[PDB]
């Protein structure tokens, strides 16, 4: 009955993606279901600003070990996805039921992610390089993990788990688009993730973008971050083009298409700072076309006076004439 509970939580923590996960072949289903729920618990902890950094550090660091602590649970989370923490033993139970080859992979990502969450908890994301570093820790590693799980089940060639660079890029693409899109929500939640070296060139404090009077500078920085994000497209197309399993393809392609759609909607969009912006992926050729169309949507919107105009155009030309 535990597995059932796990699937109930999955649907509770996922609005639409649960259907896609449940559609995974063989062992990848339970393996990915558990992976998602465990990553959700850790995420809920990191995001919980009602918890002090003093309490969070050991929690983030010891999360991996918590997977092997049958009774461990967290009752002080005032987040939306509390239950995943509160009933963690149910999830850890099913995690220990997974094939050891899967456990090995999941535990390693959780440990590394924990170190990473703690590292950036009380410090500013400074350079764009550090932005990649953070993104790698919370989303890149997820791509690395998934890729390794895919290969371990054998539904995907061993190559998939080997190319960490490709799997990482997949994660960075999704993470950055979310950090960009969720700016206001994070501000309101007391969270900051935008690169200081980028925002300090536009405004005094990151929160200043939320102030009406600074909308023009907010949009320019927004545009610069999005241009930064586009650079992962080639790797995303490469990663996706190597997948052989249909359920895996749909699993990976859906979020990447939804991401580019989001970037396209957010690009040069003032609404990103006032609130949340409202916005075929079954074969590679179709996926490429979808991505390309969205890239053009952004291209047409490029304000010739935008500080990043030339940059945005160049990465788009690269995507256009590449793979």
Ligand X SMILES: CC(C)(C)CN1C(=O)[C@@H](CC(=O)N[C@@H](CC(=O)O)C(=O)O)O[C@H](c2cccc3ccccc23)c2cc(Cl)ccc21
Q: Is 12 in the site for ligand X (CB under 6 A)?
A: no
DSSP string, 67-128: TT-TT-------STTHHHHHTHHHHHHHHHTS-HHHHHHHHHHHHHHHHHHHHHHTS---SH
Q: Is 11 in the site for ligand X (CB under 6 A)?
A: no
CB 134 within 8 A of CB 63: no
Which residue in 82, 191, 242, 313 is the catalytic one?
Answer: 191
Task: Reply yes or no on whether 242 is catalytic.
Answer: no
CB atoms closer than 10 angstroms to residue 309: 14
Q: Is 39 in the site for ligand X (CB under 6 A)?
A: yes
Q: How many CA atoms lie within 13 A of 307 on its CB side?
A: 15
Complex with ligand X: residue 29 or 313, whichever CB lies closer? 29
Residue 136 beta carbon to ligand X: minimum distance, rounded to whole angstroms: 10
Task: Reply yes or no on whether 73 is catalytic.
Answer: no
Q: Is 142 in the site for ligand X (CB under 6 A)?
A: yes
Kindly write out the interface string for residues 284-323 of this chain, putting x where it contacts ligand X by CB under 6 A and - elsewhere: ----------------------------------------
Rule CB under 6 A: choose which of 5, 11, 17, 250 binds ligand X.
17
Task: Reply yes or no on whether 191 is catalytic.
Answer: yes
Which residue in 63, 134, 150, 273 is the catalytic one?
Answer: 134
Which residue reads 């169309």 in tokens? 293
Q: Is 255 in the site for ligand X (CB under 6 A)?
A: yes
Q: Is 45 in the site for ligand X (CB under 6 A)?
A: no
Burial 211-244 (b: 16+ CB within 10 A, else e): eeebbebbbbbbbbbbbbbbbbbbbbbbbbebbe
Residue 253 beta carbon to ligand X: minimum distance, rounded to whole angstroms: 8
181 marked ligand binding residue: yes
Rule CB under 6 A: choose which of 1, 4, 15, 278 binds ligand X.
15
Q: Is 150 in the site for ligand X (CB under 6 A)?
A: no
Q: Is 174 in the site for ligand X (CB under 6 A)?
A: yes
Looking at beta carbons, which residue is closest to ligand X? 143
224 marked ligand binding residue: no
Q: CA 230 → CA 129, 135, 295, distances in Å?
A: 15, 14, 9
82 marked ligand binding residue: no
Q: Is 192 left (phi over 0), alpha (psi -120 to 50) or beta?
A: beta
Rule CB under 6 A: choose which of 16, 52, 305, 321 binds ligand X.
16
Q: CA 198 → CA 75, 129, 184, 217, 284, distances in Å?
A: 38, 11, 17, 11, 34
Of 153-161, 185-193, 202-210, 247-255: span binding ligand X (CB under 6 A) = 247-255
CB 243 within 8 A of CB 223: no
Q: Residues interacting with ligand X, by CB under 6 A?
A: 14-17, 32, 35-36, 39, 138-139, 142-143, 146, 170-171, 174-175, 251-252, 255, 258
Q: Which residues are catalytic?
A: 134, 181, 191, 251
């Amino acid at each position: 009955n535990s597995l059932k509970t796990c699937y109930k939580y999955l649907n509770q923590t996922s609005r639409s993606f649960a259907a896609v996960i449940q559609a995974l072949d063989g062992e990848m289903r339970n393996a990915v279901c558990i992976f998602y729920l465990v990553l959700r618990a850790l995420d809920t902890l990191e995001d919980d600003m009602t918890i002090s950094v003093e309490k969070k550090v050991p929690l983030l660091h010891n999360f991996h070990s918590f997977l092997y602590q049958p009774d461990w649970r967290f009752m002080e989370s005032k987040e939306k996805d509390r239950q995943v923490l509160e009933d963690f033993p149910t999830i850890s139970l099913e995690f220990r039921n997974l094939a050891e080859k899967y456990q090995t992979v999941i535990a390693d990502i959780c440990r590394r992610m924990g170190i990473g969450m703690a590292e950036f908890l009380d410090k500013h994301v400074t350079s764009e390089q550090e932005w990649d570093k953070y993104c790698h820790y919370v989303a890149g590693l997820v791509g690395i993990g998934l890729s390794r799980l895919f290969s371990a089940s054998e539904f995907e060639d061993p190559l998939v788990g080997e190319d960490t660079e490709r799997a990482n890029s997949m994660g960075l693409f999704l993470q950055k688009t979310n950090i960009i899109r969720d700016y206001l929500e994070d501000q309101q939640g007391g969270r900051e993730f935008w690169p200081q070296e980028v925002w300090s060139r536009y405004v005094k404090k990151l929160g200043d973008f939320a102030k009406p009077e600074n909308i023009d500078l907010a949009v320019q920085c927004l545009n610069e971050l999005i241009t930064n994000a586009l650079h992962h497209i080639p790797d995303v197309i490469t990663y996706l083009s190597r997948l052989r399993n249909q359920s895996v393809f749909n699993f990976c392609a859906i979020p990447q298409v939804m991401a580019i759609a989001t970037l396209a909607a957010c690009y040069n969009n003032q609404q990103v700072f006032k609130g949340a912006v409202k916005i075929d992926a079954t074969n590679m050729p179709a996926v490429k076309a979808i991505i390309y169309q969205y890239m053009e949507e952004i291209y047409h919107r490029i304000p010739d006076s935008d500080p990043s105009s030339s940059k945005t155009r160049q990465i788009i030309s690269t995507i256009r004439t590449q793979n």
